[PDB]
Every structure is written in C-alpha cells, then in structure tokens.
C-alpha cells in the first residue's frame, strides 16, 4: 500500500534472493566467510540501490556491510530474533546507519537449519524529505 511499505517488500524480496543464493550458504563454511560474502553483498547493494546488504551469522556477527569497520561486530537494531527462528520480516529499526526499513531473511543450510541473516535496508530519510 504506502510507498514505504512497497520499499520494505522490495527490500525483503532482495534479502530472500540473497539468502537463497548458493554462494551465501557455501561461504558460511569458509574459514573467513567475509572474503567471498563482502564483494558479493557490495555487488547486490550496487544493483539494488539499497543502503546496505548486511549478511550476519546466528550470533548477529556481520560478515558483510558497506562499512568494512562493521565486519566482525554485532548487528544493531534489535530485530534479529524472529529471523533466527526462520521467519522473514519487514522491520523499521535504528541500525548503525540510522532509522531504516529493512527486509530481513533467514539463511538456511543444505539441511534447512538457520545459520544466519540477510538484512537489506533503505534509510527512512531517503524515502521522504525529513
């Protein structure tokens, strides 16, 4: 319905597409998943025009973020719990980069267990003039 709601639904479509990309689950088995995930997430961020395509593990530790300083630190916003249960969500929260609408999708392993999170966001300040 609203433009913000539609941007959220697009963000979740991107997050579920990223989460289902074979490279992403495979990279979780690497000694340092960031080596393959950071360049992949940056290409999707460029294609989609999202503020970020964040990829994190079950502890909320980032493997990919547009700011490399954020890699290896905890995701911010307090909206991971439902995703770690295997549910996709559209969430408005304050991330490290500020208030955003995010589509957040679980990453499943080859057995269907949740191993991580994809978060695709657009800052609220970019949806309408403050």
Numbering used by the authors: 32 to 161
The article reads:
Membrane bound histidine kinases (HKs) are ubiquitous sensors of extracellular stimuli in bacteria. The PASp and PASc domains are connected to the TM2 helix by two linkers: the PASp/TM2-linker and the TM2/PASc-linker (topology and domain organization shown in Fig. 1A).
This triggers a piston-like pulling of TM2 and a quaternary structure rearrangement in the cytosolic PAS domain (PASc). The contraction of the overall β-scaffold of PASp leads to a random coil to α-helix transition in the PASp/TM2-Linker. This result is in agreement with the conversion of the disordered region downstream of the last β-strand in the PASp core (residues 152-158) in the citrate-free state to a helix (P-helix) extending to the TM2 helix, in the bound state.
